[PDB]
Amino acid sequence: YLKNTRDLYYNDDYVSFLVNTVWKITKPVHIVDYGCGYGYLGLVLMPLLPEGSKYTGIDSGETLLAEARELFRLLPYDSEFLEGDATEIELNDKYDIAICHAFLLHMTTPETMLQKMIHSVKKGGKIICFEPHWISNMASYLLDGEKQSEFIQLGVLQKLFESDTQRNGKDGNIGMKIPIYLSELGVKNIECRVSDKVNFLDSNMHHNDKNDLYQSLKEEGIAGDPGDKQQFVERLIARGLTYDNALAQYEAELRFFKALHLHSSLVYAPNMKITFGEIEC
Amino acid sequence: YLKNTRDLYYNDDYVSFLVNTVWKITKPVHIVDYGCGYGYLGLVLMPLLPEGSKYTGIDSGETLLAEARELFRLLPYDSEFLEGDATEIELNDKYDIAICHAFLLHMTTPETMLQKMIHSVKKGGKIICFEPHWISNMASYLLDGEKQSEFIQLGVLQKLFESDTQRNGKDGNIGMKIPIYLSELGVKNIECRVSDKVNFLDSNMHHNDKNDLYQSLKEEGIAGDPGDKQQFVERLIARGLTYDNALAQYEAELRFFKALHLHSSLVYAPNMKITFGEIEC
Secondary structure: OHHHHHHHHOOHHHHHHHHHHHOOOOOOOEEEEEOOOOOHHHHHHOOOOOOOOEEEEEEOOHHHHHHHHHHHHOOOOEEEEEEOOOOOOOOOOOEEEEEEEOOHHHOOOHHHHHHHHHHOEEEEEEEEEEEOOHHHHHOOEEEOOOOHHHHOOHHHHHHHHHHHHHOOOOOOOHHHOHHHHHHHOOOEEEEEEEOOOOEEEOOOOOOHHHHHHHHHHHHOOOOOOOOOHHHHHHHHHOOOOOHHHHHHHHHHHHHHHHHOOOOOOEEEOOOOEEEEEEOOO | OHHHHHHHHOOHHHHHHHHHHHOOOOOOOEEEEEOOOOOHHHHHHOOOOOOOOEEEEEEOOHHHHHHHHHHHHOOOOEEEEEEOOOOOOOOOOOEEEEEEEOOHHHOOOHHHHHHHHHHOEEEEEEEEEEEOOHHHHHOOEEEOOOOHHHHOOHHHHHHHHHHHHHOOOOOOOHHHOHHHHHHHOOOEEEEEEEOOOOEEEOOOOOOHHHHHHHHHHHHOOOOOOOOOHHHHHHHHHOOOOOHHHHHHHHHHHHHHHHHOOOOOOEEEOOOOEEEEEEOOO
């Protein structure tokens, strides 16, 4: 969860740079995390934030909160978790910072949820959103020995993701849209940054770290088995793709699954998008 | 050149983070820049490097060096420019750091040129390469009001760039390959980072800065006029694309040209790739 996921998307020194240099957080702050899951964003920022800071996570997963609480019980950070639907929870407090990680992409109406987070922030406070941008993520793959187009059909994926959003409303590319939504909502000093993280599975590095990276990469689902060909094609067709596009997609995922292994050389840049602004004081 | 290009690809605070925190350069260093052009990389790093550092640029552009020299004559940085072909120039010195910016993508044999740069570096020295990754760059566009697939055909561009490389050897996506080449060459402590820069043309920001950003964006060629339709399609077909792909490409560039303007909301992340390592001491 931390030596894996976290380590795959952010360089801790870069996050520290964001906390001390860009955001310049010096005084302890009270932050609220929407859709905190097991407290991932807390395990990332709390260690870097000023001593005396308070972390508050919000989520509906009952068993989820149980793990989060047990996970933070051991840590020296003041943390609390509230059970409830983040889309309707009513907070009685105002926080210095409101954050969320890979949460807005699952909303059918991102703007509304953002409006809510904003309202829980005190004047002069900040809002930080860690959201992905699937399309730029997929385009950020390099596998020595294979042409990217062989195992990644950017065109099909580009149409696919655009379709899904057209339906349910979920946006896997919402990460680059946060700035726009934040603007329409009147947030000030808006700014977006890309996590500088780049994973490098070095075919010439022979150390446990290289092995550990491969393991992390696979536990994330990178280059997974596409499974039954028929089910795959059908499932995709039902999402707005044609039979040819879906087939090309299958063969692509199949190729990646068969091409990536511990001995390979892979360069991957998650391209996570970090957007933030200040609430007009 | 400085309040335009530079400001469009890197956040100065991020570059400072790379110099002081990641690379931890404390003692003054002697750096050599291959294909320095007018000294762009010098105008970026020299201000951040320890006082007493020396910058040396290499390029063949006679008039090019004239501007570079005149540009640095006024600055308080020790700089010199050597005229010659960077692919065959013979240096009589060893440097603390060898760097290059958007230079390796124009080589027909990147590995060889890298081997050369490495040989000009002293034991314990570093090699820094600032190279682009066109595919991830193109995928990092967001224009409010338009679907990305409408003005950017990732699929066609993905095939196009792969083809060009197949021919002349030039790699517009060499930025993610530097780690691999560096590894095969025996470089140690290899690491790659993405510039965290994200440009945001804010349709709700009404300040000279927003106007200045738009101007910079256009001076870079973003959303330029595709020109004569016939010439465009033919020129692309000659690069390995079909007539349909080329046409779809034309209409896409045309759409972007007609859609982007000063009043628009655009989010662009150049996604420049910064790869570096140390020369085994």
